[PDB]
Amino acid sequence: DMYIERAGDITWEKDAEVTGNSPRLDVALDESGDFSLV
Amino acid sequence: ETTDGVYRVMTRRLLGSTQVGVGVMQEGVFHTMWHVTKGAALRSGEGRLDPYWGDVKQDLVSYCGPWKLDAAWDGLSEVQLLAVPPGERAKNIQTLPGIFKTKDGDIGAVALDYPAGTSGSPILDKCGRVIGLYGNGVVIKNGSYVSAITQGK
Numbered sequence: 094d095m096y097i098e099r100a101g102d103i104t105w106e107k108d109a110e111v112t113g114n115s116p117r118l119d120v121a122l123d124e125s126g127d128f129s130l131v
Numbered sequence: 132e133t134t135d136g137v138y139r140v141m142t143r144r145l146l147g148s149t150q151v152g153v154g155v156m157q158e159g160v161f162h163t164m165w166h167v168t169k170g171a172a173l174r175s176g177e178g179r180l181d182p183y184w185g186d187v188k189q190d191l192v193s194y195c196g197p198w199k200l201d202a203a204w205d206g207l208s209e210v211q212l213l214a215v216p217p218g219e220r221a222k223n224i225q226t227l228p229g230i231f232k233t234k235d236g237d238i239g240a241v242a243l244d245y246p247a248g249t250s251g252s253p254i255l256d257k258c259g260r261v262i263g264l265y266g267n268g269v270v271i272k273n274g275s276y277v278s279a280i281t282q283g284k
């Protein structure tokens with residue numbers, strides 16, 4: 094059995110850590126809900 | 132507890148208490164990714180949440196009502212993943228989304244890598260609205276991860 098427990102409000106944080114790039118990727122979404130690179 | 136906010140999805144059919152994913156409670160509806168619960172009922176305190184709508188291809192599922200989240204990435208601005216990793220505090224990570232180009236159109240994507248149990252963490256815009264859920268993506272050359280910004284209708 095699964096159960097849920099609260100972890101916080103949904104809010105933007107002004108002092109947030111910034112990271113990650115912004116790649117543009119050709120992808121396909123199959124019937125199973127899996128993305129794949131094209 | 133139906134208070135709006137982000138929630139961990141836990142199970143104990145494993146060793147100890149394991150966090151299998153994350154979700155968003157808004158307007159009395161719990162939102163998460165399909166691969167987190169596979170559509171199973173959920174317990175919240177003394178009450179039970181039953182699945183209401185789900186779609187394996189979108190990898191989304193909602194409990195107690197139809198999908199409520201309808202904000203979308205503007206295309207131009209940075210966003211924040213409110214990552215809720217297992218055993219760790221909710222943490223905002225700001226990023227400029229990339230793009231999944233598909234036959235049917237373009238989807239925002241974030242190049243952030245977290246444990247599998249982070250699946251379902253919300254991504255937010257600057258006005259605080261949830262523009263999608265984290266956790267359905269691809270693995271690129273490097274070997275790390277890019278998740279779609281998965282939003283329902």
Ligand SMILES: C[C@@H]1NC(=O)[C@H](NC(=N)N)CCCCNC(=O)[C@H](CCCCN)NC(=O)[C@H](CCCCN)NC(=O)Cc2cccc(c2)CNC1=O
Nearest residue numbers: 126127128129166245246247250266267268269274275276
């Ligand atoms: C725990 C750890 N990290 C990761 O798993 C991922 N980070 C990374 N891999 N760098 C981050 C996961 C974030 C949460 N999201 C998921 O769990 C979803 C659940 C599937 C729903 C698909 N409907 N999985 C995915 O989105 C992608 C889809 C790939 C589709 C391609 N056709 N699958 C994987 O990464 C599995 C994997 C591949 C290589 C190597 C590994 C794991 C080894 N690493 C690990 O085990």
